[PDB]
Design a protein around this ligand. Structure first.
Ligand SMILES: [Mg+2]
Ligand SMILES: [Mg+2]
Ligand SMILES: [Mg+2]
Ligand SMILES: [Mg+2]
Ligand SMILES: [Mg+2]
Ligand SMILES: [Mg+2]
Ligand SMILES: [Mg+2]
Ligand SMILES: [Mg+2]
Ligand SMILES: [Mg+2]
Ligand SMILES: [Mg+2]
Ligand SMILES: [Mg+2]
Ligand SMILES: [Mg+2]
Ligand SMILES: [Mg+2]
Ligand SMILES: [Mg+2]
Ligand SMILES: [Mg+2]
Ligand SMILES: [Mg+2]
Ligand SMILES: [Mg+2]
Ligand SMILES: [Mg+2]
Ligand SMILES: [Mg+2]
Ligand SMILES: [Mg+2]
Ligand SMILES: [Mg+2]
Ligand SMILES: [Mg+2]
Ligand SMILES: [Mg+2]
Ligand SMILES: [Mg+2]
Ligand SMILES: [Mg+2]
Ligand SMILES: [Mg+2]
Ligand SMILES: [Mg+2]
Ligand SMILES: [Mg+2]
Ligand SMILES: [Mg+2]
Ligand SMILES: [Mg+2]
Ligand SMILES: [Mg+2]
Ligand SMILES: [Mg+2]
Ligand SMILES: [Mg+2]
Ligand SMILES: [Mg+2]
Ligand SMILES: [Mg+2]
Ligand SMILES: [Mg+2]
Ligand SMILES: [Mg+2]
Ligand SMILES: [Mg+2]
Ligand SMILES: [Mg+2]
Ligand SMILES: [Mg+2]
Ligand SMILES: [Mg+2]
Ligand SMILES: [Mg+2]
Ligand SMILES: [Mg+2]
Ligand SMILES: [Mg+2]
Ligand SMILES: [Mg+2]
Ligand SMILES: [Mg+2]
Ligand SMILES: [Mg+2]
Ligand SMILES: [Mg+2]
Ligand SMILES: [Mg+2]
Ligand SMILES: [Mg+2]
Ligand SMILES: [Mg+2]
Ligand SMILES: [Mg+2]
Ligand SMILES: [Mg+2]
Ligand SMILES: [Mg+2]
Ligand SMILES: [Mg+2]
Ligand SMILES: [Mg+2]
Ligand SMILES: [Mg+2]
Ligand SMILES: [Mg+2]
Ligand SMILES: [Mg+2]
Ligand SMILES: [Mg+2]
Ligand SMILES: [Mg+2]
Ligand SMILES: [Mg+2]
Ligand SMILES: [Mg+2]
Ligand SMILES: [Mg+2]
Ligand SMILES: [Mg+2]
Ligand SMILES: [Mg+2]
Ligand SMILES: [Mg+2]
Ligand SMILES: [Mg+2]
Ligand SMILES: [Mg+2]
Ligand SMILES: [Mg+2]
Ligand SMILES: [Mg+2]
Ligand SMILES: [Mg+2]
Ligand SMILES: [Mg+2]
Ligand SMILES: [Mg+2]
Ligand SMILES: [Mg+2]
Ligand SMILES: [Mg+2]
Ligand SMILES: [Mg+2]
Ligand SMILES: [Mg+2]
Ligand SMILES: [Mg+2]
Ligand SMILES: [Mg+2]
Ligand SMILES: [Mg+2]
Ligand SMILES: [Mg+2]
Ligand SMILES: [Mg+2]
Ligand SMILES: [Mg+2]
Ligand SMILES: [Mg+2]
Ligand SMILES: [Mg+2]
Ligand SMILES: [Mg+2]
Ligand SMILES: [Mg+2]
Ligand SMILES: [Mg+2]
Ligand SMILES: [Mg+2]
Ligand SMILES: [Mg+2]
Ligand SMILES: [Mg+2]
Ligand SMILES: [Mg+2]
Ligand SMILES: [Mg+2]
Ligand SMILES: [Mg+2]
Ligand SMILES: [Mg+2]
Ligand SMILES: [Mg+2]
Ligand SMILES: [Mg+2]
Ligand SMILES: [Mg+2]
Ligand SMILES: [Mg+2]
Ligand SMILES: [Mg+2]
Ligand SMILES: [Mg+2]
Ligand SMILES: [Mg+2]
Ligand SMILES: [Mg+2]
Ligand SMILES: [Mg+2]
Ligand SMILES: [Mg+2]
Ligand SMILES: [Mg+2]
Ligand SMILES: [Mg+2]
Ligand SMILES: [Mg+2]
Ligand SMILES: [Mg+2]
Ligand SMILES: [Mg+2]
Ligand SMILES: [Mg+2]
Ligand SMILES: [Mg+2]
Ligand SMILES: [Mg+2]
Ligand SMILES: [Mg+2]
Ligand SMILES: [Mg+2]
Ligand SMILES: [Mg+2]
Ligand SMILES: [Mg+2]
Ligand SMILES: [Mg+2]
Ligand SMILES: [Mg+2]
Ligand SMILES: [Mg+2]
Ligand SMILES: [Mg+2]
Ligand SMILES: [Mg+2]
Ligand SMILES: [Mg+2]
Ligand SMILES: [Mg+2]
Ligand SMILES: [Mg+2]
Ligand SMILES: [Mg+2]
Ligand SMILES: [Mg+2]
Ligand SMILES: [Mg+2]
Ligand SMILES: [Mg+2]
Ligand SMILES: [Mg+2]
Ligand SMILES: [Mg+2]
Ligand SMILES: [Mg+2]
Ligand SMILES: [Mg+2]
Ligand SMILES: [Mg+2]
Ligand SMILES: [Mg+2]
Ligand SMILES: [Mg+2]
Ligand SMILES: [Mg+2]
Ligand SMILES: [Mg+2]
Ligand SMILES: [Mg+2]
Ligand SMILES: [Mg+2]
Ligand SMILES: [Mg+2]
Ligand SMILES: [Mg+2]
Ligand SMILES: [Mg+2]
Ligand SMILES: [Mg+2]
Ligand SMILES: [Mg+2]
Ligand SMILES: [Mg+2]
Ligand SMILES: [Mg+2]
Ligand SMILES: [Mg+2]
Ligand SMILES: [Mg+2]
Ligand SMILES: [Mg+2]
Ligand SMILES: [Mg+2]
Ligand SMILES: [Mg+2]
Ligand SMILES: [Mg+2]
Ligand SMILES: [Mg+2]
Ligand SMILES: [Mg+2]
Ligand SMILES: [Mg+2]
Ligand SMILES: [Mg+2]
Ligand SMILES: [Mg+2]
Ligand SMILES: [Mg+2]
Ligand SMILES: [Mg+2]
Ligand SMILES: [Mg+2]
Ligand SMILES: [Mg+2]
Ligand SMILES: [Mg+2]
Ligand SMILES: [Mg+2]
Ligand SMILES: [Mg+2]
Ligand SMILES: [Mg+2]
Ligand SMILES: [Mg+2]
Ligand SMILES: [Mg+2]
Lengths: 48, 92
RNA sequence: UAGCGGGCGUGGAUCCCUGGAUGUCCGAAUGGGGGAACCCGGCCGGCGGGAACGCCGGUCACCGCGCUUUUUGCGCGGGGGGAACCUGGGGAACUGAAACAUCUCAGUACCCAGAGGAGAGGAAAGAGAAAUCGACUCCCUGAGUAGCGGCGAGCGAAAGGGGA
RNA sequence: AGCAGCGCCAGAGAGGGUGAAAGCCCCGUAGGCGAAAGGUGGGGGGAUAGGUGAGGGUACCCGAGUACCCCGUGGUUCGUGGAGCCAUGGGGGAAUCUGGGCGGACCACCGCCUAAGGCUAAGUACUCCGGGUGACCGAUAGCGCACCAGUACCGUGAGGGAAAGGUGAAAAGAACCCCGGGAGGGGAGUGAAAUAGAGCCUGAAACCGUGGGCUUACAAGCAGUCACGGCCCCGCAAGGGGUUGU
RNA sequence: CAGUGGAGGCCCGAACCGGUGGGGGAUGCAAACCCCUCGGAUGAGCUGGGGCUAGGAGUGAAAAGCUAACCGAGCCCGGAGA
RNA sequence: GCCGACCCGCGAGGGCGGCUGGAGGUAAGGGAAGUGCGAAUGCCGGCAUGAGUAACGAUAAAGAGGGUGAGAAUCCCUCUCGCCGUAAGCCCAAGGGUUCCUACGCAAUGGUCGUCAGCGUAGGGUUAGGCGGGACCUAAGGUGAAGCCGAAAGGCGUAGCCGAAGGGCAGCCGGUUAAUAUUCCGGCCCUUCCCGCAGGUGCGAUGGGGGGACGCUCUAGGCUAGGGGGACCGGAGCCAUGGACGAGCCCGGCCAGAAGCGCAGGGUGGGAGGUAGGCAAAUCCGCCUCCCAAAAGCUCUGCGUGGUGGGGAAGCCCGUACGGGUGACAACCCCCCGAAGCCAGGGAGCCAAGAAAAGCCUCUAAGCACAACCUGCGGGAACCCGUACCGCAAACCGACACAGGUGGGCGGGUGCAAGAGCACUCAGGCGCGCGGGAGAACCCUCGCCAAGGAACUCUGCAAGUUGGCCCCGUAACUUCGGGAGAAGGGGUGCUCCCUGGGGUGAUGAGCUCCGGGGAGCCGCAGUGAACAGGCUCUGGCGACUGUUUACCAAAAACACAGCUCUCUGCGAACUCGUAAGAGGAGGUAUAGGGAGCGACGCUUGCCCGGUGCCGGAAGGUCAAGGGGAGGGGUGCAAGCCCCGAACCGAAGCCCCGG
């Protein structure tokens, strides 16, 4: 039955993407923490 | 900056296949136009290219111990030299 | 970091400090776009036979201030980051009060802007009772005092004195 | 490097390492020396910007939507209180030293200070960074991370978030033969040691197994305890240990 | 009246959408499945792709349903050792 | 650390001895604390129990010979058997990300096995002006110079810019690799850009105009895909087992293709004058006037043809692999069925009234007219990204080689009234990655049953009966449509004979589509298998189709067309927002918001005391504020300061009425 994860890349990137995060003060802090924690991936990756 | 687009020849039965016809395929630099692979191999093997073909070679992922790898990407270009011409340099 | 294959060092190699060079692409990211690391350009040079095509070097974001003849211009600056500290704008609730509403938690948590090796504050329209003191900040003290308080729970100074 | 014998150094007997336990072997330690280059640097020196007089007259100036007053609030120890002071959203709205503000309503006296422009180091705060020290941890501790960890993995995402250190002094890492497809072993060999043989120091417990001793198929059970007895074992015996029949 | 015509939240019935009854499953094939049966099926239809709306908020042919497998107030981190 | 039957201590402990261990330890006497664990459904780890138990993931299904190999139920090959075949085959898109192909290999992964693999190691493998996307357009939306708003962060937003499965745009057939192919190659055919030239024209755009440019349902003509038959064309072969050497059987008889020609369609009025409009730029468009042709012409597209290129079976030898030969010098032709596709912007009807923008064409402005546009030809130029493989699944989403989920295209034949249904079957693909036996209860799915036939039971739950098509026939009631598939019946196969009509051809034969009449044959039974309604009567609720509690409720609940009330005059009421603003609505009372009722029929009574709402210029109370008699504090005073009566002061409430 339709589960919940229905991958689509435009979506992934348009929504949790980097350009996207920088766009809003909210996402900016996210990048900020992400980086200050030392995450390797600052945002989901997308092979398309 | 010209012997830089050409990287090394690709060596493969399939590469050889087309030496017989007019077709020399080699590893080029990944950011190279066909417009440049042209003026490149042209000023490099003193031939005239009538036709360049390209394709990326997504690099396979190898590994070792726990350490999980990823081979570098590449870009074969394959050049069709003016009729009759040849490149002894490659025909070994 | 052994190995295969080759080299270099007293004509001071490796290596360590200092300055310089180079430094693709993305990122404030700034020629334009964009789904970051990709795509597409204008201008002036250059490269290939080179007009068409491609590449190479330079250059072109926006805002503020100053100068300039409206203007086109020209220069100086800004933008983003930073563990904690700091300052300004905004600002809770659990909780305590053995319910709860004033009150408390607390101007705390946090959000936002800014500052910087600190930041604030700072040379009295002051203190407050001595005809005295003499900017500001910090520590000790004064003091759990003075007071504040559904005079509940609680909260809680200053002057002065000793110091930096 | 222990033990022994005889020596020496010390402005150095902090500490570390070397096959174990070293002042004298090694690196250090005490003491002392050093920068072409970049950074720092009034601490010392020099220079510049600036700055400094007494009396008399004059009544020109001395920070405006400001003082001030009232309404609404904030700050302060101050919760509307007798409620000032500082600050200011709304309304009215001055003066220039016969000016103004304050000294907790208000008034009089006395006294203090000069608002409505700005700047100012030090003393202070913190710790990403470097170092030093610990009646601080020693791999379930200490940072989440001693290890390739903000990883693997988990979540669309914000985000969550592990596990995992140790052969030996030296790799000397076990040629070679043997069984096996391999794995793994048995010999040989190295080593002080190989049940130190490679997730290899030590190697506890649960848990699984092999061998041996005592025991059990008419027997009733919180599993033990008390007694006697048989068997087995240690001791010459007196004794003790194991087992368990009643 | 006959002809022609070809309307309709019309009828039967696949795809497709759905879940009526029963059986099965119940450490499942499966954190909602299977079989038989059944409802709609030119419409208030089903559907791919691109978009917008969210936490006292959205969305709701209204069940307090849905809002990333538990929603009478989502998830995360924080206040927090309430 | 391990052992002890010894010693000391009341005990927690300490000591001693043996074995292991192999580099630290820390008296006496004091000090300091992360200081003693059996329990917290405690936290971490390890290891047990259940138990060799349940399971091994669709009941589509196996068997044998040969080969490989240390080892085969499980890998390769062969034959037989079975299952799918609107799929369980084939091609796209998404997601996935090397899973593709080779070679070597089996520790683990694989629910068993594994020599195999989608697994480990390594090497190869993805080629484009023309396919898709970008150097094109615009949609919702997003962003956003201006501008507006907000304590900050930020919100809204014009132009513009971004945004696609929509608009526009030039490639078809065939061959080749182990693995790519409108991408390489072969053949035929195109597109832009630049340069030179020929000819031609007022050229020129971002601006004006045309066009692009549109719904649903039904539908004509012609054609193609696709499919069937052929005694005709080609073909290696076959005569079995009683018969057949034949109009026998079996196989195959296509694909692309420019110009031109043909067939079928779409598009399009032509000429002249005047013009105040398309934000006074126009020869264009619009609008008025008259004349002509009423159709052609011109323009475009589909098909057929077409120089020529290609391909081309069964069967047989070689063959693990997989193809290559044979295999023809192949033939390549007739007839029929025929689309939902094509011509395409076709036609008709309907009401719910059916994107934009660029390309393209045209008009002019600035500017140029040695330019520049336009047409032909010649020569040159033509980038970036994707291209493997999986793709209804063992490669995507579901922790799994999970019976679930996933958009578009193709989806053959025969039969059944039709069909994408059903049964069987091509092509193609599979037998679902544990087997072997046995033939107990019991469970599941399924078959049948004497007599009875609802006695079962909460309930005919479940099963069963019925079932398609054709003809006969069919009631209350009704809103005249219905109720109807009411009910109940009869027919249905096969053979011969007579015959009616439609289609293509030509009017005929052949092919095909739908029938009507008689005669007869067999069986228990003729929609002989599979698909396939049991029926009636009478209450309740709800008018009706719809909606719903994703995962225990599908209903009598919600919704609904319709009715009434009420608000709202437009900068509307109302809603979201602090605001700007937006929605309402580019709507205007035949409208919009709220509320209740809920097709339709007939109807809807009385009670305004209380509550709400509506009305009520009186009165009553009523805050700030205004007012200031009167009183106070202080000063020597001028003053300063405070308190304060009457009186004026909204809405609300009271009151009055609906
Ligand atoms: Mg791999
Ligand atoms: Mg430089
Ligand atoms: Mg850059
Ligand atoms: Mg950029
Ligand atoms: Mg360019
Ligand atoms: Mg250039
Ligand atoms: Mg030249
Ligand atoms: Mg510049
Ligand atoms: Mg001048
Ligand atoms: Mg900064
Ligand atoms: Mg702080
Ligand atoms: Mg309380
Ligand atoms: Mg309490
Ligand atoms: Mg309490
Ligand atoms: Mg603050
Ligand atoms: Mg700074
Ligand atoms: Mg300092
Ligand atoms: Mg300072
Ligand atoms: Mg300051
Ligand atoms: Mg001063
Ligand atoms: Mg001051
Ligand atoms: Mg003094
Ligand atoms: Mg009290
Ligand atoms: Mg306080
Ligand atoms: Mg000091
Ligand atoms: Mg100090
Ligand atoms: Mg001596
Ligand atoms: Mg030592
Ligand atoms: Mg030196
Ligand atoms: Mg020195
Ligand atoms: Mg100093
Ligand atoms: Mg001097
Ligand atoms: Mg001077
Ligand atoms: Mg004087
Ligand atoms: Mg004021
Ligand atoms: Mg005052
Ligand atoms: Mg206060
Ligand atoms: Mg106050
Ligand atoms: Mg009070
Ligand atoms: Mg005062
Ligand atoms: Mg004020
Ligand atoms: Mg006083
Ligand atoms: Mg006085
Ligand atoms: Mg530090
Ligand atoms: Mg440190
Ligand atoms: Mg740890
Ligand atoms: Mg551990
Ligand atoms: Mg660390
Ligand atoms: Mg995951
Ligand atoms: Mg070795
Ligand atoms: Mg050995
Ligand atoms: Mg030998
Ligand atoms: Mg083998
Ligand atoms: Mg080994
Ligand atoms: Mg030892
Ligand atoms: Mg041992
Ligand atoms: Mg081993
Ligand atoms: Mg091991
Ligand atoms: Mg052991
Ligand atoms: Mg014994
Ligand atoms: Mg006995
Ligand atoms: Mg014994
Ligand atoms: Mg009809
Ligand atoms: Mg219908
Ligand atoms: Mg129906
Ligand atoms: Mg569908
Ligand atoms: Mg539903
Ligand atoms: Mg149900
Ligand atoms: Mg059950
Ligand atoms: Mg739709
Ligand atoms: Mg909420
Ligand atoms: Mg969660
Ligand atoms: Mg708290
Ligand atoms: Mg010991
Ligand atoms: Mg000690
Ligand atoms: Mg002590
Ligand atoms: Mg403790
Ligand atoms: Mg403890
Ligand atoms: Mg305990
Ligand atoms: Mg329990
Ligand atoms: Mg067990
Ligand atoms: Mg059993
Ligand atoms: Mg079993
Ligand atoms: Mg099975
Ligand atoms: Mg079957
Ligand atoms: Mg078999
Ligand atoms: Mg063989
Ligand atoms: Mg063999
Ligand atoms: Mg053999
Ligand atoms: Mg279907
Ligand atoms: Mg792999
Ligand atoms: Mg392939
Ligand atoms: Mg294996
Ligand atoms: Mg296995
Ligand atoms: Mg499995
Ligand atoms: Mg094999
Ligand atoms: Mg093998
Ligand atoms: Mg094999
Ligand atoms: Mg071509
Ligand atoms: Mg380009
Ligand atoms: Mg505006
Ligand atoms: Mg655009
Ligand atoms: Mg195209
Ligand atoms: Mg393929
Ligand atoms: Mg192929
Ligand atoms: Mg000429
Ligand atoms: Mg013109
Ligand atoms: Mg002109
Ligand atoms: Mg134009
Ligand atoms: Mg135009
Ligand atoms: Mg236009
Ligand atoms: Mg237009
Ligand atoms: Mg359209
Ligand atoms: Mg045909
Ligand atoms: Mg045909
Ligand atoms: Mg013939
Ligand atoms: Mg015969
Ligand atoms: Mg046949
Ligand atoms: Mg046959
Ligand atoms: Mg005709
Ligand atoms: Mg005109
Ligand atoms: Mg005129
Ligand atoms: Mg004109
Ligand atoms: Mg004209
Ligand atoms: Mg003209
Ligand atoms: Mg035709
Ligand atoms: Mg043709
Ligand atoms: Mg033809
Ligand atoms: Mg022909
Ligand atoms: Mg011909
Ligand atoms: Mg040309
Ligand atoms: Mg491909
Ligand atoms: Mg599936
Ligand atoms: Mg999965
Ligand atoms: Mg399977
Ligand atoms: Mg589907
Ligand atoms: Mg079909
Ligand atoms: Mg199976
Ligand atoms: Mg029977
Ligand atoms: Mg019976
Ligand atoms: Mg009977
Ligand atoms: Mg009977
Ligand atoms: Mg009975
Ligand atoms: Mg009953
Ligand atoms: Mg039933
Ligand atoms: Mg029957
Ligand atoms: Mg009936
Ligand atoms: Mg029949
Ligand atoms: Mg004819
Ligand atoms: Mg039926
Ligand atoms: Mg009744
Ligand atoms: Mg009745
Ligand atoms: Mg009714
Ligand atoms: Mg219904
Ligand atoms: Mg439900
Ligand atoms: Mg509006
Ligand atoms: Mg409006
Ligand atoms: Mg509107
Ligand atoms: Mg309207
Ligand atoms: Mg009536
Ligand atoms: Mg009534
Ligand atoms: Mg009156
Ligand atoms: Mg009086
Ligand atoms: Mg008096
Ligand atoms: Mg008096
Ligand atoms: Mg007076
Ligand atoms: Mg009066
Ligand atoms: Mg009034
Ligand atoms: Mg009144």
């Amino acid at each position: 039955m339709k589960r919940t994860w229905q991958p689509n890349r435009r979506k992934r990137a348009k929504t949790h993407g980097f350009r996207a995060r920088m766009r809003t003060p909210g996402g900016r802090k996210v990048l900020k923490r992400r980086r200050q924690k030392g995450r390797w991936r600052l945002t989901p990756a997308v092979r398309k | 900056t010209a012997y830089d687009v050409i990287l090394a020849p690709v060596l493969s039965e399939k590469a050889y296949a087309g030496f017989a016809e007019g077709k020399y395929t080699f590893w080029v630099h990944p950011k190279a136009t066909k417009t440049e692979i042209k003026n490149a191999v042209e000023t490099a093997f003193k031939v005239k290219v009538v036709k360049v073909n390209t394709l990326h070679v997504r690099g396979k992922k190898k590994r070792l111990g726990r350490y999980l790898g990823k081979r570098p990407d590449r870009k074969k270009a394959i050049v069709q030299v003016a009729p009759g011409q040849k490149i002894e340099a490659l025909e070994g």
